[PDB]
Every structure is written in C-alpha cells, then in structure tokens.
Swiss-Prot record, chain A:
This is DNA-directed RNA polymerase subunit alpha. GO terms for cellular component: cytoplasm; DNA-directed RNA polymerase complex. The chain holds residues 253 to 322 of 330 of the full protein. Homodimer. The RNAP catalytic core consists of 2 alpha, 1 beta, 1 beta' and 1 omega subunit. When a sigma factor is associated with the core the holoenzyme is formed, which can initiate transcription. Belongs to the RNA polymerase alpha chain family.
Swiss-Prot record, chain C:
Residues 2-104 bind DNA. It is found in: Cell membrane. The chain holds residues 19 to 127 of 294 of the full protein. This is Cholera toxin transcriptional activator. It comes from Vibrio cholerae serotype O1 (strain ATCC 39315 / El Tor Inaba N16961). This transcription activator controls cholera toxin, pilus colonization factor and outer membrane protein expression in V.cholerae. It binds to the 5'-TTTTGAT-3' tandemly repeated DNA sequence in the cholera toxin promoter region. ToxS interacts with the C-terminal periplasmic domain of ToxR, stimulating its activity. It activates transcription at the promoters for tcpI and tcpA and this is presumably via ToxT. It comes from the Bacteria. Signal peptide: none annotated.
Length: 70, 112, 110, 109
C-alpha cells in the first residue's frame, strides 16, 4: 500500500499531527524515512514508533525500504 | 536596555528581562515570588501583551504558539487554563475570555 | 604584635614562641619555617592562600630555593606539634588544588 | 559581597568559603570551600540572579575549551547542591528548557 494518504493510516491524533508537519503525506516517504530521523522529530518517541511500525506491518508495509523513482 | 515590566491587578508583577512573575507584598517589593513560566506561558503572555487592549483571535494565538503545528484547539484551551492556574487566577480576571472574540489580559501599567 | 589562635594558643611572629593556656608552664618551641608559615596564614584571616604563593613568600625571602615536599613536611610538623587533628578541620587544613586553610580564630593582643 | 541563601546560608566574596550563619561576616557553622569549578558555577548562578541561567552559558563559562559529554552538566550541579546540602532541591532550582537559578535572599556589598 504505497497509494494511500498518511491520514488513511488510522493513526492516532498525536502521530497524525506530528507527521503532518514534516510534509509527509504518502507512505512512499515513510517507508524509507529512516528510523533515526523519525526519532529525532518533535513529539515522537519509541512507544509511538512501535505503533507506527505495527500499523505498517498490518498492511504489509514496514520501515527500512530501499526503493525506486517516483 | 529596553526593559518592560508589566503590572497586573492584585499587584502582580511580570518582569520581562528576568522572565519572573511575583506577588507584591508591598507596592513593588519583590519578596513573594510565584516563579518562572515555561516557554509557551511566556509566549502567550507576550501575545496578549502585544495586542493590548484589543482582543487576540484564537487563530493568531495558535499560529504564534505553534508556528508549524497542526495542533487542536484543546491544547489552546488547556494552555490558557494552565497559564491562568499558575497565575492563581481562579476568578478569571487576569486572562479574560472575550466572548466570541478571543482573549485579553488585564494589565494596569507598563514600566520602562 | 602577639596573636591568639582559637582562644587557646598564643604566638608571636617576632620571637617564635607558642603558649598553650591549658598548660601555661610548658612553652612550645617551633621551627622558623613553620612559624613563618602560620604567621603568613594569620596575616590573611580564613581565606585560601596558594601553595605556590605561600611557598615563594616563605622561602625566597630566606634567599634559597627548596622543593615543594618541604612545605608539606613543615605543615605536617605544624599540625603535629600544635596537636591539631590528623585530618579533621579543627585549626589548620589543606584544600586540594587551591592551597592551605586555617580555622583557628585570630585575636591580636596588641 | 555576601550572598544569603535559604536555611540561613551565606557565600562570601570578602572571603572564599560557604557557611550557615546569621551574621554575614562571622564564620558560623562552616561548610568549607568549594572547588574551582564549584566556585565558578556558584558565581555564574549568582551573577545571573534573579534571571534563569542558560545551560549553554554555564557550559561555555565553566568549560570554555572542553568537549563536555553533556552529562557532567548534571553531575556537577548535583554534587554542588549536595555540598550545599540541598536535599529538598530548593536551594538551586531547575526551570526546564530555560536553565538553572540559585535562590539568593540578599546581597551585601
């Protein structure tokens, strides 16, 4: 699922309002958005990164995706 | 230095240089120190001071507190609540909620 | 001018004598170096003096240069003969990296 | 200059030592003498009084040429309060993301 807006991720209000500021609107950014850079962002800890990765894993996706052109 | 000191009802004093808020147990004698606000309490206080005496609309308050944030209005309400709590304003006179027009801060005088 | 230390001992910088009020019969004899060190400490009441500055003021006026173990030995003899505590801060103590300290009070007789 | 602190504490610049006294210049209930770094920290916190003192100011005043591991900031201002016996964390206050401050009652010059 690389064709959905991030708001369709069923993300909680905290994660949605955080990731909205980083101009991250499609999963294609997030699948290669590195774990470290995701952790550096304001208001995003390990226990929320866990749920982000869990929602990704439910729909096949995950972080750490070497990828292709746009 | 451009020093600005704000006098609030119940002889409250807010010193901008030291960023300190204290009760005056005399006309202007500092001995009863309420303390130092955080970096949004001070920001919202600055917003309400810069728009005095006009009420400040909530959208600009949010855009100044959160320049690049999709922050819900609940955080606005509770930020105002906590700022009024730490200023001991249980009677809602210090930071008044202008009905359907935003917020004002009750300030008597400015000392430079 | 005679000095009184901690309301107990009496000492003069000019004759190098020590008198204990508890035992006024027994005069306490001190060496010149330790006596001059204690007098330099008394001249600056209760603030830190440097080991380097106290050492150079005590021994370069003497006209001769010695190693820094000499100051440590002199202070050891001063603490021993004054019967000051071995490591508690009662009369004289050492502040590391800063110098030496006195605790006894200063009372100028005249 | 004599700085007064809660619990009737005094730090002296007419001398170089800290004490618990009711008489400014009289050495009552001596604590001792802080170290070089401790004395510098106390001087910085007393100079920034009554304003909070920024963390970067403290690190560049205490360690102008040191690669501080960012955790000596807390060990230093832990043992500094311990040496002043701040068991209740009231003598020196930490306002978060703004800095440190030290509670000074009065200044004698």
């Amino acid at each position: 699922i690389l064709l959905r807006p991030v708001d369709d991720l069923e993300l909680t209000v905290r994660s949605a309002n955080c990731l909205k500021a980083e101009a991250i609107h499609y999963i294609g950014d997030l699948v290669q958005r590195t774990e470290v850079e995701l952790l550096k962002t304001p208001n995003l800890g390990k226990k929320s990164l866990t749920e982000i990765k869990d929602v990704l894993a439910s729909r096949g996706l995950s972080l750490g995706m070497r990828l292709e052109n746009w | 230095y451009v020093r600005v000191i704000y006098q609030f009802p119940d002889n409250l004093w807010w010193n901008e240089a030291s960023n300190q808020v204290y009760y005056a147990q005399d006309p202007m004698k500092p001995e009863r120190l309420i303390g130092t606000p955080s970096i949004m309490q001070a920001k919202l206080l600055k917003i309400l001071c810069e728009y005095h005496p006009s009420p400040c609309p909530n959208d600009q308050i949010i855009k100044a507190l959160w320049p690049h944030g999709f922050i819900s209005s609940e955080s606005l309400t509770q930020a105002i609540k906590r700022t009024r709590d730490f200023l001991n304003d249980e009677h809602k006179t210090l930071i008044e909620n202008v009905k359907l027009q935003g917020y004002r801060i009750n300030i008597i005088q400015v000392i430079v | 001018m005679k000095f009184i230390l901690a309301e107990k001992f009496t000492f003069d910088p000019l004759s190098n004598t020590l008198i204990d009020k508890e035992d006024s019969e027994e005069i306490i004899r001190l060496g010149s170096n330790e006596s001059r060190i204690l007098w330099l400490l008394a001249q600056r009441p209760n603030e830190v003096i440097s080991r380097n500055d106290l050492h150079d003021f005590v021994w370069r006026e003497q006209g001769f240069e010695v190693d820094d173990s000499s100051l440590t030995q002199a202070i050891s003899t001063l603490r021993k003969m004054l019967k000051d505590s071995t490591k508690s801060p009662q009369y004289v103590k050492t502040v590391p990296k800063r110098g030496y300290q006195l605790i006894a009070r200063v009372e100028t007789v005249e």
